[PDB]
Amino acid sequence: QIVERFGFSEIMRSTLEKDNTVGTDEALLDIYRKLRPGEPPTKESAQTL
Amino acid sequence: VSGAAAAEAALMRALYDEHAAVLWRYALRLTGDAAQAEDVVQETLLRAWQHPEVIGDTARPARAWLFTVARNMIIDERRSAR
DNA sequence: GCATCCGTGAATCGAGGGTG
DNA sequence: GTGTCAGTAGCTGTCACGGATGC
RNA sequence: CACCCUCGA
Secondary structure, three states, X not given: XXXXXXXOOHHHHHHHHHOOXXXXXXXXXXXXXXXXXXOOOOHHHHHHO | OHHHHHHHHHHHHHHHHHHHHHHHHHXXXXXXXXXXXXXXXXXXXXXXXXXXXXXXXXXXXXXXXXXXXXXXXXXXHOOOOO
């Protein structure tokens, strides 16, 4: 669906391609450990904030 | 044997990783000073290691016991220190 | 072997007044 | 002595430049 | 004295 919305631009396609991790529950923990480092990452502890 | 004297460490390093980075924030908001908070955290966790009658019952909230330790130490500094 | 990012620096003197 | 969730503010509205730092 | 403000050539 992301490709569906931002497909008219090559820069967004290249962003989704050059991405490191894929998955709804993966990028979420990525954000958590970069936003509040040093804490155990719970799926719901990140979904809450 | 020696594995037990190592189990003590691996028990602390396993609560640090789950509670120090959160206890820090508590003392931070209450002091507005990350340096003191840094100090208070070590003071508190040393007491924790010194008081094993609290972490043994893993099923009970340790974090909740820690917050009060710190919250008390800060005010102890906030006595007639003015 | 090379782009990124770190650290350095950025006019002179002078008056009064407040707070931590 | 302490014991159920218990969790920053603030902020990027400067810039030119050289060279160690790092991918 | 630490910062802060306002100002003068």
